[PDB]
């Protein structure tokens, strides 16, 4: 099964998923002296007040927080988008290191991890039609820094000992990913595709220009999941990133200047 190991890692996806080698492939670098700003692009509009968590789950990748999508709760809307996008999952991306974790990077820099609110278009009626579509995705990433904590974020980490190997999954209710934001929301925008398998390319990239900060202690917990499940050798969740793909003839749009 693919993963992040030496044996069944990155460079060896291509081999079950050809697309790998595709001409929209995500992650990507942001060189921010060749991105362009295109005074044509609105802002976002982040519309999370009636977000509906419903549960946290390990899936061996990485972890999810799960909401409901069965209606316009929580959605995103404007920025180069056309549509409503529903929200319905979050996912996080880390190192084994402070200096690296994210899989998107900025003139090369490379942050501790990075936050993926993962949202659908609703013209395509269900999650699993959209992801056939060249616009069926649309992902806000967020880069975390180390440094203050994060107070939104303890809730996440404080539950992470009940799922801590693959499978496992615990209610979580009432959380608000409002509290994951950070103050500004210019952005840099790219079509691209899923960063794991099966690397679809339906996504319309949305990342924040300002990255969160996050405490040592909150992302040491994170290192403390394992990619194996219960009863298994245990392998610690770390490096869950793919690294930067060519962009190939690609433009990074900057909603600001
Ligand atoms: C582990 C599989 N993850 C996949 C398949 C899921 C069904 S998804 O919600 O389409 C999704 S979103 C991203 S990312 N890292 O480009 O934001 C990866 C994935
Ligand atoms: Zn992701």
Not at 49 to 73: C, M, P
Not at 102 to 107: A, C, G, K, L
Request: charged share 25%; hydrophobic share 35%; glycine share 8%.
């Amino acid at each position: 099964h693919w993963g992040y190991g030496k044996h069944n890692g990155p460079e060896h996806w291509h081999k079950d998923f050809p697309i790998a080698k595709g001409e929209r492939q995500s992650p990507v670098d942001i060189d921010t002296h060749t991105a362009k700003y295109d005074p044509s692009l609105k802002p976002l509009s982040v519309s999370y007040d009636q977000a509906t968590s419903l549960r946290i789950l390990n899936n061996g990748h990485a972890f999810n927080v799960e909401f409901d999508d069965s209606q316009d709760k929580a959605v995103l809307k404007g920025g180069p988008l056309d549509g409503t996008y529903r929200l319905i999952q979050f996912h996080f991306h880390w190192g084994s290191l402070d200096g690296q974790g994210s899989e998107h990077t900025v003139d090369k820099k490379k942050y501790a991890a990075e936050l993926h609110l993962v949202h659908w278009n609703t013209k395509y009626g269900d999650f699993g039609k959209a992801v056939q579509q060249p616009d069926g995705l649309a992902v806000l990433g967020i880069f975390l820094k180390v440094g203050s904590a994060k107070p939104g974020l303890q809730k996440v980490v404080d539950v992470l000992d009940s799922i801590k190997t693959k499978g496992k999954s615990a209610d979580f209710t009432n959380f608000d990913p409002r509290g994951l934001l950070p103050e500004s929301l210019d952005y840099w925008t790219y079509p691209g595709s899923l960063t794991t398998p099966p690397l679809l390319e339906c996504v319309t990239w949305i990342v924040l220009k300002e990255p969160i900060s996050v405490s040592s202690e909150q992302v040491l917990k994170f290192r403390k999941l394992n990619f194996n499940g219960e009863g298994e050798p245990e392998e610690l969740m770390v490096d869950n990133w793919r690294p930067a793909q060519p962009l190939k003839n690609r433009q990074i749009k900057a909603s600001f200047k």
